[PDB]
Design a protein around this ligand. Structure first.
Ligand SMILES: CC(=O)N[C@H]1[C@H]([C@H](O)[C@H](O)CO)O[C@@](O[C@H]2[C@@H](O)[C@@H](CO)O[C@@H](O[C@H]3[C@H](O)[C@@H](O)[C@@H](O)O[C@@H]3CO)[C@@H]2O)(C(=O)O)C[C@@H]1O
Length: 623
């Protein structure tokens, strides 16, 4: 928890009681575990919805949906049962509540099971299953001098009549909400991302939405890949962004502009960025994923555990901030090495909160954290993004001012700031590591075997913010060569392996004063010419499996070659700059590199020309 932040145990395992109703009697009953947090704001009333697992944290056991609500931002709370299960057997349960706030209403979607002790995706059919929607109406009152609220929960209604028996290529089995908090779209539709099974026991995600305040429901025609569960969605620039759990794999993220009729993997931004464990080979998790406006900027907040422990332990709940370009790790929200899987982040009245799980020995509580320090960090980072974008956008570029320098898709920028071992991203998300470097205005001067800088791509590890580069990127830099090399030496490039020896796209320079652009593993043809001590502007672009190399705004002869040779998607290890930064590679690049920009798309000709013409205006030095 960041400085100034704090928490309390709000739903306290084996301690907190809830009003358990059975056969007309209500009794305050102790709950073993509380899971499945969903924290929302209903026009001033904070509401925390969760599972109340009465007897055990085992999934297939007696569970009702509990709600705690507060009109004083979490200082005090009232408790109720929002949805009771069928009471059919000792393991009857309403499960994985998924919440949408609209007006003064809470719409809560839960699966319902009567007697199965088996995990839901193992069921061969839906004999034990129903899908229920309950609506809580929140009413406020200023009775007695102080603010009060109450929530009246309606009886649950089954939505099973809206579930078709067939979908493309399949027979349906069951579905559940994706857990946590869903949305109202800008057109008013209630939108639940749902996880669905078929009769082959495959799981996949869909959009399940209502145009009439929840009276009827429809499925979008499209779907995610099989294997995608617990989807969580937000709306961004007219599209739904659907972020999915993939057990034992990297999280897939999709975009849909048509209420789920068509799904496109978000390969250029967020898909495959987040891994469920250090080696992305462990179970995944539910994630909070919301779009909020902080100091005038629309951004997304995302949480997921790092899960160093593995299996379902899911320690180290982390918070992430992104503007759909840059992806910043705000930090760890949970404390130390506690197990802390599911979470829900709420931004209300310019204050940030998180309701999340803590698990010791499979006994779960929900803690309620005030994210004071985290909001401070977020605001600072957003200020930096806004300030650098404004700086670049406002430069009067050379002819009357010509086209503005583009900041659309600008993800990272290495310029004047550097420490002894790192070249600092102006956007504060991903620094490059360095060796044998000396600080110069707006960049670094490198020399010697092992020299250079490494801007990690897959080397970022569990969370890969630059995964987009495997699909498209532009890498831009100003360079000056100080010594004619003995053979061919590297200057800039994207490497597929850790050494730099297997390149996707790169630029080297040689002893006959020629450039050596490298297109994948294609034979290298030297071309053009450069002069020692003269500064040049370099652009590397890749999109649609084609790589190009520009020197001083102009493509080298023969550029625009295929660099992705087959069906496999590249897995770039890193960008290398000014050398390989590998003592094991015997090359000695003696060069200065300044102002390295990374974009998540292939820049157009005008944008490249503008960067070339403005290369001496973009640096961070004076600031
Ligand atoms: C309806 C439902 O079950 N929802 C829970 C989901 C799903 O089970 C999951 O997405 C698979 O469909 O996941 C959560 O529950 C898991 C949690 O209870 C852990 C606690 O250790 O156990 C997981 O089951 C494991 C079990 O631990 C293993 O020993 C072995 O039996 O495999 C099962 C695989 O299911 C539960 O899946 C979750 O926390 O991830 C929570 C939802 O309530």
């Amino acid at each position: 928890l960041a400085p100034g932040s704090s928490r309390v145990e709000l739903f306290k395992r084996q301690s907190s009681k809830v009003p358990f109703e059975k056969d007309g009697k209500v009794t305050e009953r102790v709950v073993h575990s509380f899971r499945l947090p969903a924290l929302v704001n209903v026009d001033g009333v904070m509401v925390a919805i969760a599972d109340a697992r009465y007897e055990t944290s085992f999934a297939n056991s007696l569970i009702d949906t509990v709600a705690k609500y507060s009109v004083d931002d979490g200082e005090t709370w009232e408790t109720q049962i929002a949805i009771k299960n069928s009471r059919a057997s000792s393991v009857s349960r309403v499960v994985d509540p998924t919440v949408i706030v609209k007006g003064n209403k809470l719409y809560v979607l839960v699966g319902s099971y009567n007697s199965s002790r088996s995990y839901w995706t193992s069921h061969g059919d839906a004999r034990d299953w129903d899908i229920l929607l309950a609506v809580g109406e929140v009413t406020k009152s200023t009775a007695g001098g102080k603010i009060t609220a109450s929530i009246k929960w309606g009886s649950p209604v089954s939505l099973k009549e809206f579930f078709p028996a067939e979908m493309e290529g399949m027979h349906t089995n069951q579905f559940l909400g994706g857990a946590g908090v869903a949305i109202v779209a800008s057109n008013g539709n209630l939108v639940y991302p749902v996880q669905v099974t078929n009769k082959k026991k495959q799981v996949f995600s869909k959009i399940f939405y209502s145009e009439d305040e929840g009276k009827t429901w429809k499925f979008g025609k499209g779907r995610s890949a099989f294997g995608c569960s617990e989807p969580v969605a937000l709306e961004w620039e007219g599209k739904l962004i659907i972020n999915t759990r993939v057990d034992y794999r990297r999280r897939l993220v999709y975009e849909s502009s048509d209420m789920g009729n068509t799904w496109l993997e978000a390969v250029g931004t967020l898909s495959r960025v987040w891994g469920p464990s250090p080696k992305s080979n462990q179970p995944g998790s539910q994630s909070s994923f919301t779009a909020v406006t902080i100091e005038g900027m629309r951004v997304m907040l995302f949480t997921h555990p790092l899960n160093f422990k593995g299996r379902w332990l899911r320690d180290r709940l982390n918070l992430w901030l992104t503007d759909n370009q840059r992806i910043y790790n705000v930090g760890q929200v949970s404390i130390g090495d506690e197990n802390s899987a599911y979470s829900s982040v709420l931004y209300k009245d310019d204050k940030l909160y998180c309701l999340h799980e803590i698990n010791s020995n499979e006994v779960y509580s929900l803690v309620f954290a005030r994210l004071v320090g985290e909001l401070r960090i977020i605001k600072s980072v957003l200020q930096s993004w806004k300030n650098w974008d404004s700086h670049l956008s406002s430069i009067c570029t050379p002819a009357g001012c010509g086209p503005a320098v583009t900041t659309v898709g600008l993800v990272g920028f290495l310029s004047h700031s550097a420490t002894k071992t790192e070249w600092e991203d102006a956007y504060r998300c991903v620094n490059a590591s360095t060796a044998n470097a000396e600080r110069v205005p707006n960049g670094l001067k490198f020399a010697g075997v092992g020299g250079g800088a490494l801007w990690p791509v897959s080397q970022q590890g569990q969370n890969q913010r630059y995964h987009f580069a495997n699909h498209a990127f532009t890498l831009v830099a100003s360079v000056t060569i100080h010594e004619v090399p003995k053979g061919a030496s590297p200057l800039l490039g994207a490497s597929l392996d850790s050494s730099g020896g297997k390149k996707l796209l790169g630029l080297s320079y040689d002893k006959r004063h020629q450039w050596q652009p490298i297109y994948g593993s294609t034979p290298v043809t030297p071309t053009g010419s450069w002069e020692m001590g003269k500064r040049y502007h370099v652009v590397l672009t890749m999109a649609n499996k084609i790589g190009s190399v520009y020197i001083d705004g102009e493509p080298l002869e023969g550029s625009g070659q295929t660099v992705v040779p087959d069906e496999r998607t590249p897995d770039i290890s890193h960008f290398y700059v000014g050398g390989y930064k590998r003592s094991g590679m015997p090359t000695d690049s003696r060069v200065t590199v300044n102002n390295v920009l990374l974009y998540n798309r292939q820049l157009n000709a005008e944008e490249i020309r503008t960067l070339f013409l403005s290369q001496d205006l973009i640096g961070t030095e004076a600031h």
